[PDB]
Amino acid sequence: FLKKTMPFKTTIEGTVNGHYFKCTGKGEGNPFEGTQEMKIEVIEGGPLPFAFHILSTSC
Amino acid sequence: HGSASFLKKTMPFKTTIEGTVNGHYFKCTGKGEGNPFEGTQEMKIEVIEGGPLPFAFHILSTSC
Amino acid sequence: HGSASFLKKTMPFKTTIEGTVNGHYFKCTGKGEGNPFEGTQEMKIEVIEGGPLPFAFHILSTSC
Amino acid sequence: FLKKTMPFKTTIEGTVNGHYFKCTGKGEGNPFEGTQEMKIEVIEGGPLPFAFHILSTSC
Amino acid sequence: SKTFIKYVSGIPDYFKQSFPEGFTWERTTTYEDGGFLTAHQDTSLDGDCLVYKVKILGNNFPADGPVMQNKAGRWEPSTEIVYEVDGVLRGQSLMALKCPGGRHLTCHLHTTYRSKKPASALKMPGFHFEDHRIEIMEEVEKGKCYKQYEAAVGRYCDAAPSKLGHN
Amino acid sequence: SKTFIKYVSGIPDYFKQSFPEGFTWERTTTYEDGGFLTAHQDTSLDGDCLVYKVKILGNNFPADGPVMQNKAGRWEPSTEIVYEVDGVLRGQSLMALKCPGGRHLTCHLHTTYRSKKPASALKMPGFHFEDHRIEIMEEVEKGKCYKQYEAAVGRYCDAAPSKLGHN
Amino acid sequence: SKTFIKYVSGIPDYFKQSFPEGFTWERTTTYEDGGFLTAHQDTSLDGDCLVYKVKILGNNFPADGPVMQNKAGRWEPSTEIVYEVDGVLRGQSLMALKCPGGRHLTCHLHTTYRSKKPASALKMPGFHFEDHRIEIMEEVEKGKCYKQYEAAVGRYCDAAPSKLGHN
Amino acid sequence: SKTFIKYVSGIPDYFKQSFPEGFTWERTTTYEDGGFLTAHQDTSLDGDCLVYKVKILGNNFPADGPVMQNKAGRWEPSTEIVYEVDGVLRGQSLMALKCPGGRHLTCHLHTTYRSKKPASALKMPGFHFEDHRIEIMEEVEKGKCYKQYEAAVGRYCDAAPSKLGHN
Numbered sequence: 001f002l003k004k005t006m007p008f009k010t011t012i013e014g015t016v017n018g019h020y021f022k023c024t025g026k027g028e029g030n031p032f033e034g035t036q037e038m039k040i041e042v043i044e045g046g047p048l049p050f051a052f053h054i055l056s057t058s059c
Numbered sequence: 060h061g062s063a064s065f066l067k068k069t070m071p072f073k074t075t076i077e078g079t080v081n082g083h084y085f086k087c088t089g090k091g092e093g094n095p096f097e098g099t100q101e102m103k104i105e106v107i108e109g110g111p112l113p114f115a116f117h118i119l120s121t122s123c
Numbered sequence: 124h125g126s127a128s129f130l131k132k133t134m135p136f137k138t139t140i141e142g143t144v145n146g147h148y149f150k151c152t153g154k155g156e157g158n159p160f161e162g163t164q165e166m167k168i169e170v171i172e173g174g175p176l177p178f179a180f181h182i183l184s185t186s187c
Numbered sequence: 188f189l190k191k192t193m194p195f196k197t198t199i200e201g202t203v204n205g206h207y208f209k210c211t212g213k214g215e216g217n218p219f220e221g222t223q224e225m226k227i228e229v230i231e232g233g234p235l236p237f238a239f240h241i242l243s244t245s246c
Numbered sequence: 247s248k249t250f251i252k253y254v255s256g257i258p259d260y261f262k263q264s265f266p267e268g269f270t271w272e273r274t275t276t277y278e279d280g281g282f283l284t285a286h287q288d289t290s291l292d293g294d295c296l297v298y299k300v301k302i303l304g305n306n307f308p309a310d311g312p313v314m315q316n317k318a319g320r321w322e323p324s325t326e327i328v329y330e331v332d333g334v335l336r337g338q339s340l341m342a343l344k345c346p347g348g349r350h351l352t353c354h355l356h357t358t359y360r361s362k363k364p365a366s367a368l369k370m371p372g373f374h375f376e377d378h379r380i381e382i383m384e385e386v387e388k389g390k391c392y393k394q395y396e397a398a399v400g401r402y403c404d405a406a407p408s409k410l411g412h413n
Numbered sequence: 414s415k416t417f418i419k420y421v422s423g424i425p426d427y428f429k430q431s432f433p434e435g436f437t438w439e440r441t442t443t444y445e446d447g448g449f450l451t452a453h454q455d456t457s458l459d460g461d462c463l464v465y466k467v468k469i470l471g472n473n474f475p476a477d478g479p480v481m482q483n484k485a486g487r488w489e490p491s492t493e494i495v496y497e498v499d500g501v502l503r504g505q506s507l508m509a510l511k512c513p514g515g516r517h518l519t520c521h522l523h524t525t526y527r528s529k530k531p532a533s534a535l536k537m538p539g540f541h542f543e544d545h546r547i548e549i550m551e552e553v554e555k556g557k558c559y560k561q562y563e564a565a566v567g568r569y570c571d572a573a574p575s576k577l578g579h580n
Numbered sequence: 581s582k583t584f585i586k587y588v589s590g591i592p593d594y595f596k597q598s599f600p601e602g603f604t605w606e607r608t609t610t611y612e613d614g615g616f617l618t619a620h621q622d623t624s625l626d627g628d629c630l631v632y633k634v635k636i637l638g639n640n641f642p643a644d645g646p647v648m649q650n651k652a653g654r655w656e657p658s659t660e661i662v663y664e665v666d667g668v669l670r671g672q673s674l675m676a677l678k679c680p681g682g683r684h685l686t687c688h689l690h691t692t693y694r695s696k697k698p699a700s701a702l703k704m705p706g707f708h709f710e711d712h713r714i715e716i717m718e719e720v721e722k723g724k725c726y727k728q729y730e731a732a733v734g735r736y737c738d739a740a741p742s743k744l745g746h747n
Numbered sequence: 748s749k750t751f752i753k754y755v756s757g758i759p760d761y762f763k764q765s766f767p768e769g770f771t772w773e774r775t776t777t778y779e780d781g782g783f784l785t786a787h788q789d790t791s792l793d794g795d796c797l798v799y800k801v802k803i804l805g806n807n808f809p810a811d812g813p814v815m816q817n818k819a820g821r822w823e824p825s826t827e828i829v830y831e832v833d834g835v836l837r838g839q840s841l842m843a844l845k846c847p848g849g850r851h852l853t854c855h856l857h858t859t860y861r862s863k864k865p866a867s868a869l870k871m872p873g874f875h876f877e878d879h880r881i882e883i884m885e886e887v888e889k890g891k892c893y894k895q896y897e898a899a900v901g902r903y904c905d906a907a908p909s910k911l912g913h914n
Contacts, residue, residue, distance in 0.1 A: 006461070011465070015469070017474050029414075031416050034566055036417040040559045051479065051482075051484070070296060078304065079304065079453050081304060098251045098740075100250040103393050117321060121275070122287065134629075145641050157730075159584055162734075165730075177650070180716070182652075193795070198801065199802075200802055200803065218751050227895060234890025238814045239890070241805060244881070282441040303439070305453070306439070331476075333476070340673070342663065350665070358473055377739045379742060399739040405735060505853060564907035575824075576884065610777075
């Protein structure tokens with residue numbers, strides 16, 4: 001069911017220190033080579049009042 | 060406030076709880092009443108989705 | 124025990140403390156007295172090696 | 188001050204869950220190749236009432 | 247449900263002060279056997295009725311532990327330390343489940359309480375204790391329906407007084 | 414985004430084995446300065462496209478810390494330890510956020526990965542390492558749009574081999 | 581110095597029971613900013629005099645934190661939860677340093693208390709609380725000499741009673 | 748025994764730079780089931796021979812756990828993250844003890860390494876990884892005599908490279 005190059009899509013909803021936010025994202029990678037890149041857009045609650053870095057492993 | 064005769068003796072509350080625990084999704088509603096200044100309260104919580112809970116309700120106690 | 128008249132009102136104590144904190148070695152002696160059944164006590168602690176302490180004494184409080 | 192092959196010696200004193208113990212040890216390794224082997228002997232408080240494994244990183 | 251606390255010794259009531267706007271709280275509870283329970287809550291006042299909205303994410307509970315096995319007896323009473331940080335209120339407490347058989351399973355609560363009022367319109371309380379008695383009065387169904395009582399008190403350490411005049 | 418890992422040395426791929434159904438994961442990340450970040454995620458396959466749905470609860474981040482100040486530098490690469498527990502996959506890793514002033518703000522990830530296939534249908538991997546390099550390629554719009562890259566490798570400790578025939 | 585506790589409500593005194601043999605305790609205190617303080621203590625009775633022997637290993641205290649900077653104000657009072665595990669007594673407490681300026685730096689104490697008597701010759705107490713008021717009454721020298729007072733009480737959560745008859 | 752590490756990729760060797768004076772380290776290892784293991788060590792050079800002096804305090808290990816039961820299997824290899832803090836070296840690692848019943852008992856090491864040379868005399872390494880394979884080669888005498896082997900490598904994450912020129 002998996003290919004050499006695969007797209008992915010994400011939706012993210014959360015609250016951090018009382019700040020609500022929503023993100024969407026679109027990406028592409030090579031699952032077997034283990035590489036990927038994605039673009040994340042804060043659609044609600046932007047600009048984020050905290051470092052994006054804490055969301056990195058959840059994208 | 061003068062005296063306790065001019066304070067609200069009891070106050071009702073309602074709750075809605077939604078979450079996931081160890082992959083298990085659930086939703087709860089609750090209703091209760093308490094004495095704000097005496098610091099006592101009781102509530103009834105109902106699991107409306109994901110029941111019966113496959114985990115101890117106790118982990119939700121501080122959240123309802 | 125019948126009554127408090129047949130209990131030890133106060134009891135002395137002595138301590139020796141040796142350790143290292145963040146690479147800093149120190150040694151302490153202490154002497155004190157307390158009321159065992161009233162649950163109160165006071166002591167004097169002396170740093171005998173590694174003084175003056177380059178860290179807050181407070182981290183040793185629960186140890187003396 | 189360091190050589191291709193170097194000996195080492197250790198003395199270890201400790202208490203674990205109220206159990207007092209003392210160890211000595213002798214070893215040898217290649218510091219630049221990053222390999223070593225050592226023999227540890229419990230000289231006091233043996234046999235240890237706990238897994239030696241909790242002392243591994245202290246030897 | 248922090249609106250229902252008896253404060254003694256003149257300790258200011260952060261929660262009752264926050265109305266009519268209300269307050270939020272956020273919490274991660276860490277269990278000694280690896281479980282995490284994270285929650286966010288909004289408290290509002292709709293006329294005469296308090297309204298709570300709660301979101302929960304729980305994870306890493308061991309399959310063989312009392313929680314996932316549904317073998318939790320009851321909560322012991324607990325005492326929270328509550329104090330100001332970053333213009334808001336922080337709380338920490340140690341709670342203990344008295345499992346059937348007598349063993350306790352403990353957990354550490356890390357809470358931030360946030361008023362919907364600005365800090366300038368609030369009298370912040372000093373460091374103090376909040377006793378919580380949480381009891382499941384009846385397991386009505388499973389699994390499905392519970393009746394829960396709580397008594398709460400905001401106080402200082404009265405039993406062991408300061409001899410310097412500190413709270 | 415665990416579908417994108419290069420596995421070497423014959424290590425079974427728990428995530429690639431999970432399709433077409435997919436998998437979930439649950440995580441709590443604890444930061445050394447008291448912040449928590451809890452997330453749950455569903456991974457599914459919609460036609461040719463991977464679909465992620467993420468829920469997040471974060472709390473107790475210090476107002477004066479690099480995270481809430483939005484003064485974080487960049488992630489160092491990290492190595493997760495991955496092994497079977499309760500018939501599913503547990504992960505743990507320490508990550509380190511480079512911060513201005515030469516600081517590293519570290520955190521501890523506690524993850525459970527759950528296939529949507531029964532454990533009977535799966536070849537469970539042995540204890541191994543998963544290297545993750547996460548990089549913000551650009552901050553397209555401040556606090557609004559980010560490009561993020563990741564390379565991941567599932568491997569054994571090849572740099573320091575066993576003398577007992579262990580992986 | 582646990583021999584000096586006022587137990588109320590008929591809570592058995594594990595420490596006073598342990599004599600003439602005495603008891604030991606072991607503890608790791610974890611500070612919120614990364615410091616660890618580990619100690620082992622032996623308590624014996626030499627005629628009429630209690631004798632304490634203490635060993636301490638402390639580490640990972642930040643150079644810029646209140647401890648290494650010697651900028652710790654005073655301890656708040658604290659409450660320990662004390663309960664039986666593995667035929668001995670366990671204790672956990674949250675303590676808080678009130679730093680000059682008003683900020684609290686907190687720490688978590690993990691203690692095991694071990695009688696020199698066998699458990700069979702002891703009446704074990706049930707889960708209860710131990711209030712500790714620790715005050716530095718005088719900084720006589722540096723650095724070098726301190727006078728410290730403590731008041732301690734063993735009690736149940738009386739302020740918020742059970743309506744099921746639990747302690 | 749940190750003198751025995753193979754460093755690659757031009758990473759400065761903090762430990763080999765520390766002679767003839769040597770170095771110390773301090774560590775607290777926290778086990779997931781509540782045990783703590785705190786150690787301090789001095790490393791010195793006596794003629795051609797390295798001399799270690801170690802002090803250890805361990806506590807709160809559960810009586811029914813693999814450690815106190817002496818039913819531990821073997822250590823998995825581990826990777827420490829190593830970086831400068833407060834002008835000295837901080838290490839952190841997660842280790843995993845294989846245990847009977849398919850269990851992994853994990854722990855978290857918090858280490859500070861301190862050269863006896865001033866930081867001025869030293870070339871400080873950047874953030875990097877230290878792979879450690881620790882192996883009990885034989886249990887010569889039960890609870891009395893052990894042979895232990897270690898291979899260690901100081902490296903960057905070469906398996907998953909940067910796209911931004913970072914190590």
